[PDB]
Design a protein around this motif. Structure first.
Motif, PDB file in Angstrom:
ATOM      1  N   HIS A 177       0.805  -1.225   0.000  1.00  0.00           N
ATOM      2  CA  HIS A 177       0.000   0.000   0.000  1.00  0.00           C
ATOM      3  C   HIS A 177       0.841   1.279   0.000  1.00  0.00           C
ATOM      4  O   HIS A 177       0.259   2.349  -0.125  1.00  0.00           O
ATOM      5  CB  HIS A 177      -1.076   0.043   1.095  1.00  0.00           C
ATOM      6  N   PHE A 227       0.150   0.871  18.026  1.00  0.00           N
ATOM      7  CA  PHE A 227       0.668   1.419  16.786  1.00  0.00           C
ATOM      8  C   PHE A 227       0.009   2.724  16.456  1.00  0.00           C
ATOM      9  O   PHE A 227      -1.202   2.847  16.586  1.00  0.00           O
ATOM     10  CB  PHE A 227       0.364   0.450  15.626  1.00  0.00           C
ATOM     11  N   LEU A 228       0.788   3.672  15.959  1.00  0.00           N
ATOM     12  CA  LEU A 228       0.283   4.962  15.502  1.00  0.00           C
ATOM     13  C   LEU A 228       0.469   5.051  13.975  1.00  0.00           C
ATOM     14  O   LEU A 228       1.053   4.151  13.363  1.00  0.00           O
ATOM     15  CB  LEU A 228       1.028   6.121  16.201  1.00  0.00           C
ATOM     16  N   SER A 282       3.471   3.549  11.448  1.00  0.00           N
ATOM     17  CA  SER A 282       4.013   2.294  11.960  1.00  0.00           C
ATOM     18  C   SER A 282       3.976   1.152  10.941  1.00  0.00           C
ATOM     19  O   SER A 282       4.581   0.122  11.206  1.00  0.00           O
ATOM     20  CB  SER A 282       3.253   1.866  13.209  1.00  0.00           C
ATOM     21  N   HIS A 316       3.193  -5.291   9.826  1.00  0.00           N
ATOM     22  CA  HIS A 316       2.043  -4.454  10.115  1.00  0.00           C
ATOM     23  C   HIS A 316       1.501  -3.731   8.877  1.00  0.00           C
ATOM     24  O   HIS A 316       2.268  -3.092   8.170  1.00  0.00           O
ATOM     25  CB  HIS A 316       2.386  -3.459  11.237  1.00  0.00           C
ATOM     26  N   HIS A 317       0.180  -3.806   8.634  1.00  0.00           N
ATOM     27  CA  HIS A 317      -0.426  -3.135   7.488  1.00  0.00           C
ATOM     28  C   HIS A 317      -1.483  -2.103   7.911  1.00  0.00           C
ATOM     29  O   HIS A 317      -1.549  -1.041   7.290  1.00  0.00           O
ATOM     30  CB  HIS A 317      -1.100  -4.158   6.535  1.00  0.00           C
ATOM     31  N   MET A 318      -2.330  -2.409   8.924  1.00  0.00           N
ATOM     32  CA  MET A 318      -3.424  -1.487   9.249  1.00  0.00           C
ATOM     33  C   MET A 318      -4.038  -1.595  10.632  1.00  0.00           C
ATOM     34  O   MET A 318      -3.864  -2.599  11.328  1.00  0.00           O
ATOM     35  CB  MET A 318      -4.551  -1.676   8.204  1.00  0.00           C
ATOM     36  N   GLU A 319      -4.825  -0.569  10.996  1.00  0.00           N
ATOM     37  CA  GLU A 319      -5.570  -0.545  12.237  1.00  0.00           C
ATOM     38  C   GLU A 319      -7.050  -0.621  11.906  1.00  0.00           C
ATOM     39  O   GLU A 319      -7.539   0.101  11.036  1.00  0.00           O
ATOM     40  CB  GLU A 319      -5.288   0.727  13.036  1.00  0.00           C
ATOM     41  N   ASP A 355      -6.073  -5.193   2.092  1.00  0.00           N
ATOM     42  CA  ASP A 355      -5.319  -3.945   2.224  1.00  0.00           C
ATOM     43  C   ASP A 355      -5.927  -2.798   1.444  1.00  0.00           C
ATOM     44  O   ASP A 355      -5.393  -2.391   0.420  1.00  0.00           O
ATOM     45  CB  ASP A 355      -3.832  -4.112   1.894  1.00  0.00           C
ATOM     46  N   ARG A 356      -7.039  -2.263   1.926  1.00  0.00           N
ATOM     47  CA  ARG A 356      -7.692  -1.124   1.302  1.00  0.00           C
ATOM     48  C   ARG A 356      -8.717  -0.483   2.215  1.00  0.00           C
ATOM     49  O   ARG A 356      -9.112  -1.076   3.229  1.00  0.00           O
ATOM     50  CB  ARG A 356      -8.282  -1.462  -0.069  1.00  0.00           C
ATOM     51  N   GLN A 357      -9.118   0.760   1.890  1.00  0.00           N
ATOM     52  CA  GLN A 357     -10.099   1.452   2.721  1.00  0.00           C
ATOM     53  C   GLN A 357     -11.510   0.997   2.408  1.00  0.00           C
ATOM     54  O   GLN A 357     -12.121   1.490   1.482  1.00  0.00           O
ATOM     55  CB  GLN A 357      -9.983   2.984   2.621  1.00  0.00           C
TER      56      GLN A 357
HETATM   57  C1  LIG Z   1      -6.578   6.738  12.103  1.00  0.00           C
HETATM   58  C2  LIG Z   1      -5.242   6.735  11.365  1.00  0.00           C
HETATM   59  C3  LIG Z   1      -4.545   8.081  11.541  1.00  0.00           C
HETATM   60  O1  LIG Z   1      -5.534   6.599   9.960  1.00  0.00           O
HETATM   61  C4  LIG Z   1      -4.360   5.584  11.853  1.00  0.00           C
HETATM   62  C5  LIG Z   1      -4.156   5.372  13.216  1.00  0.00           C
HETATM   63  C6  LIG Z   1      -3.381   4.349  13.679  1.00  0.00           C
HETATM   64  C7  LIG Z   1      -2.765   3.443  12.780  1.00  0.00           C
HETATM   65  C8  LIG Z   1      -2.018   2.315  13.205  1.00  0.00           C
HETATM   66  N1  LIG Z   1      -1.499   1.413  12.385  1.00  0.00           N
HETATM   67  C9  LIG Z   1      -1.679   1.595  11.068  1.00  0.00           C
HETATM   68  C10 LIG Z   1      -2.383   2.654  10.494  1.00  0.00           C
HETATM   69  N2  LIG Z   1      -2.598   2.798   9.105  1.00  0.00           N
HETATM   70  C11 LIG Z   1      -3.655   2.372   8.377  1.00  0.00           C
HETATM   71  O2  LIG Z   1      -4.557   1.675   8.838  1.00  0.00           O
HETATM   72  C12 LIG Z   1      -3.698   2.921   6.949  1.00  0.00           C
HETATM   73  C13 LIG Z   1      -4.325   4.330   6.904  1.00  0.00           C
HETATM   74  C14 LIG Z   1      -5.831   4.239   7.031  1.00  0.00           C
HETATM   75  N3  LIG Z   1      -6.368   3.385   5.980  1.00  0.00           N
HETATM   76  C15 LIG Z   1      -5.724   2.230   5.590  1.00  0.00           C
HETATM   77  C16 LIG Z   1      -6.376   1.334   4.739  1.00  0.00           C
HETATM   78  C17 LIG Z   1      -5.761   0.150   4.365  1.00  0.00           C
HETATM   79  C18 LIG Z   1      -4.499  -0.129   4.839  1.00  0.00           C
HETATM   80 CL1  LIG Z   1      -3.755  -1.650   4.440  1.00  0.00          CL
HETATM   81  C19 LIG Z   1      -3.822   0.747   5.665  1.00  0.00           C
HETATM   82  C20 LIG Z   1      -4.429   1.939   6.054  1.00  0.00           C
HETATM   83  C21 LIG Z   1      -2.957   3.625  11.380  1.00  0.00           C
HETATM   84  C22 LIG Z   1      -3.757   4.720  10.949  1.00  0.00           C
END
Ligand SMILES: CC(C)(O)c1ccc2cncc(NC(=O)[C@@H]3CCNc4ccc(Cl)cc43)c2c1
Ligand SMILES: CC(C)(O)c1ccc2cncc(NC(=O)[C@@H]3CCNc4ccc(Cl)cc43)c2c1
Ligand SMILES: [Cl-]
Lengths: 296, 303
Positions: A41, A131-132, A135, A154-157, A178-180
């Motif tokens: 991503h 994780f923030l 990360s 790590h990929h997402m929260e 891995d997508r919104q």
């Molecule tokens: C809330 C906030 C600031 O976006 C956040 C807060 C804490 C996080 C902690 N660990 C990973 C993060 N990134 C994601 O989850 C990213 C960005 C959002 N959308 C998304 C969609 C698909 C994939 Cl694979 C990754 C993401 C964090 C993001």
């Protein structure tokens, strides 16, 4: 004496952490030999990737820029071929873990490690991490002798604040993508074999108030455990607890009767190893390793 | 999101761990530049520990009595001196992996990471705090003496603890890197016991602000308290007195959340009275006191 949530020493992994930037996105990468592994991503991933040239990926190792000479995708991981092999590459393997297994996480931001903590792959395939934003690309690992076994990237929260990622071959743990899009962790359960291992750790450390004269069958224990959202206990779990059962003299089904009583009656104002909750993030092997001083 | 007991990455410390042997005793040492630091009790037998005269035991030793092993390489000891309860062994090789470092003496309530080692080999890393009674609730087995506690804020390692012993209650006692013990302890097998321990109040409050930052406010109430009334209640639960210094230190977390320190104190008073009623705070059914205001700001989001 004492019992702590203990992580493996992170030095062998620290020497592999790099920062990867593509456009406006900056995340972490794992530099092993002449390849940098990171979440795809950072960039239809085939269509977005074919429009990128090697020089679009900026890879920074400390204060040195590595030049990308090739790129390929494997599942949800991007593999960036670099011109320099990491001189600090440890002996390593990529391993896929099962729910209930534990690992250490080296949380990184901008290719710099900030902290290390221990965690378990939940039965719902999420991890309760810390994780923030930034990360992404931080990794999970275990150490066996001098070999680092990488098991998580790590990929997402997720919306509940829990985390989702892949093995180092880019295959997600759990039904995540891995997508919104609308994604949620399933209902989680307690890792029963791990709670029992922690109860044996408490006995080894002198905490015995929860022991009783009773035993149970595996079937009666599983009926009770299913009611309290505990994972089923299998004969494999009973076998794996054998060493701890011999060291303490408490049969696995004898300890299952203590667990049944704790689930049906609570702790009654008492704690076990300084905790008022039944702890499930220590495996039988973690208990043996910490109560024996295994080194790396 | 999320909140974990997080330790500093241990790599900079791993490259300093060595094994020190004197006679039949083997323990860990810290190799920084051309000096190896280790507990002075490495020169004692079990019999010597009742009433050791370290100056008398040390004068009988030569440099070649101390065996120092770094990985699979033997370092040669070319000098030795004692500084309080630490033995400093001058070696002929400077550690090429010596990080940027300082020796810092910490106060009760401060946290730090511990790299637990056996035979000069690191086995694990965990986070802990200097208790108000000057002990640490560690996880240490026999052979872990010489393991060290540290913080790594930026690229500098601040060494604050060296492990020396386990007390009868299973808790641990040690020194700073200048060999001065934390607490009224001695490196002698004598009837010593940890004093009554108390809860680190400023740390529980910091962790309550961490819970609010992460989205949980169920424990707040509409009340406030004076500092004196808070301390009169807190002392009844074996909580450390909260000082004006602690109130000042909590200022940044109070501004980020919009909850005054004395209003957070009122919430703590109510949690002590009521308990949690089946609820948790940051995944815990107990009030957590091993995160400082500094650790919360470090780990939690700024938003
Ligand atoms: C809330 C906030 C600031 O976006 C956040 C807060 C804490 C996080 C902690 N660990 C990973 C993060 N990134 C994601 O989850 C990213 C960005 C959002 N959308 C998304 C969609 C698909 C994939 Cl694979 C990754 C993401 C964090 C993001
Ligand atoms: C109790 C047991 C098994 O010996 C043990 C168990 C766990 C231990 C954990 N950390 C250190 C240890 N060593 C000591 O405390 C040593 C040896 C005993 N007496 C003693 C007296 C004074 C001084 Cl300064 C050091 C020691 C442990 C020992
Ligand atoms: Cl301090």
């Amino acid at each position: 004496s004492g019992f702590r949530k203990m992580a493996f020493p992170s030095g062998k992994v620290e020497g592999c952490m790099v920062q990867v930037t593509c456009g406006t996105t900056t995340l972490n990468g794992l530099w092993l030999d002449d390849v940098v592994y990171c979440p795809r991503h950072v960039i239809n991933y085939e269509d977005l990737l074919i429009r990128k040239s090697n020089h679009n990926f900026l890879v920074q190792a400390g204060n040195v820029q590595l030049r990308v000479i090739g790129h390929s995708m494997q599942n949800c991981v991007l593999k960036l071929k670099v011109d320099t092999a990491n001189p600090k590459t440890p002996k390593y393997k990529f391993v896929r873990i099962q729910p209930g297994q534990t690992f250490s996480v080296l949380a990184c931001y901008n290719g710099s490690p900030s902290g290390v903590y221990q965690c378990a792959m939940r039965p719902n395939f999420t991890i309760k991490g810390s994780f923030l934003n930034g990360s992404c690309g931080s990794v999970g690992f275990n150490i066996d002798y001098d070999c680092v076994s990488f098991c998580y990237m790590h990929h997402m929260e997720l919306p509940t604040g829990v985390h989702a990622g892949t093995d180092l071959e880019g295959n997600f743990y759990g039904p995540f993508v891995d997508r919104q899009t609308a994604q949620a962790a399933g209902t989680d359960t307690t890792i029963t074999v791990n709670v029992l291992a922690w109860l044996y750790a408490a006995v080894i450390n002198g905490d015995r108030w929860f022991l009783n004269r009773f035993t149970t069958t595996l079937n009666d224990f599983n009926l009770v455990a299913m009611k309290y959202n505990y994972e089923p206990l299998t004969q494999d779990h009973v076998d794996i607890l054998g060493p701890l059962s011999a060291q303490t003299g408490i049969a696995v089904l004898d300890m299952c009767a203590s667990l049944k009583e704790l689930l049906q009656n609570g702790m009654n104002g008492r704690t076990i190893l300084g905790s008022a909750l039944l702890e499930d993030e220590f495996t039988p092997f973690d208990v043996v390793r910490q109560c024996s001083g295994v080194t790396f």
